[PDB]
Amino acid sequence: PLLTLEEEVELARKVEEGMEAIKKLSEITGLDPDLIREVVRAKILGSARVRHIPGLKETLDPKTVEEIDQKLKSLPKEHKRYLHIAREGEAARQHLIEANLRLVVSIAKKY
């Protein structure tokens, strides 16, 4: 179904704050922000899709995402807060795209 102003603004806010949370997880962990983003994304979507991302220096497979997710679960509560923020950001991003997929059709029908 279509997004109301409030639902839209909420999802966009969650996406923004989740990207900020990924940057903060890069600051704390010393890990690569892209690898962190890919692990959060991987766990959000499922084991159905984990593939090799072109830019990543490490092959993305369930073993490395499990190691990285366990390194991300081993941090203090106030440092574990950003993991939940990023997970919520990913899920909000997914639902935002899926809720706006009709606009693409309405624009592409003209080309």
């Binding site: 109301t4 102003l5 409030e6 639902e7 603004v9 909420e10 806010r13």
Partner: protein, 226 residues
């Protein structure tokens, strides 16, 4: 949820299929209901103060404390509660009952408590001298429902008794939530001075908690049954 009409169930509560969430909304499944964008946040700020009242000794009911709605005294004939200080009147009305604070210059010189069954005879800002009637008690006078009497001290003088009540109650304050804002505080959470309730785009439109209180969420934009 249509605009202006409120929820008939509370955030976080289990619900059964067919149970109405609102006058025009019937839930088709069972589970936990959740609030989607409450447009009005009501903060009940808690207040602990000390007030006083004088009553005929024949009317009084001796008690160490007074639960809400409990009878404070019973008056055979109309009684006139009279000012025992001089100053300007600050009339503070609750849902039922009142506070009456006399101030001279800046410092308050008196704090009186008019329970239910006591009609104030003064206006806000009125100038009163000593012995001037501030209220009329008639019949039975009882504690209001919103306010309770923690402790009672009493002093016998003449044919009257004077009560010093340690009162504890809460006062409401409503905040209208605009769509671009978001509530960062749960239902029934305790907040202090400076704590953030509702965030916003720009700092000047944020909702900060003035004093100590509890939070209540009303008029949600919609309700999500999971």
């Amino acid at each position: 949820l249509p605009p202006g009409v409120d929820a008939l169930v509370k955030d976080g509560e289990e619900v059964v299929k067919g149970q109405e969430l609102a006058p025009g909304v019937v839930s088709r499944l069972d589970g936990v209901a959740l609030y989607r964008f409450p447009r009005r946040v009501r903060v009940e700020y808690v207040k602990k103060e000390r007030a006083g009242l004088r009553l005929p000794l024949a009317a009084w009911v001796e008690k160490e404390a007074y639960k809400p709605g409990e009878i404070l005294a019973e008056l055979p004939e109309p009684y006139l509660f009279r000012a025992e200080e001089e100053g300007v009147v600050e009339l503070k009305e609750l849902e039922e009952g009142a506070f009456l604070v006399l101030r001279r210059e800046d410092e308050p010189v008196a704090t009186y408590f008019l329970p239910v069954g006591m009609t104030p005879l003064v206006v806000h800002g009125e100038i009163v001298e000593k012995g001037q009637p501030l209220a009329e008690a008639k019949g039975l006078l009882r504690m209001p429902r919103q306010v309770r009497a923690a402790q009672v001290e009493a002093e016998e003088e003449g044919e009257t008794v004077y009560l010093t009540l340690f009162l504890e109650w809460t006062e409401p304050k409503d905040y209208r939530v605009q769509p671009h804002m978001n509530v960062v505080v749960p239902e029934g959470a305790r907040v202090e001075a400076g704590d953030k309730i509702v965030a916003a785009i720009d700092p000047e439109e944020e909702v900060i908690a003035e004093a100590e209180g509890v939070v209540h969420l009303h008029e949600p934009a919609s309700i999500l049954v999971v």
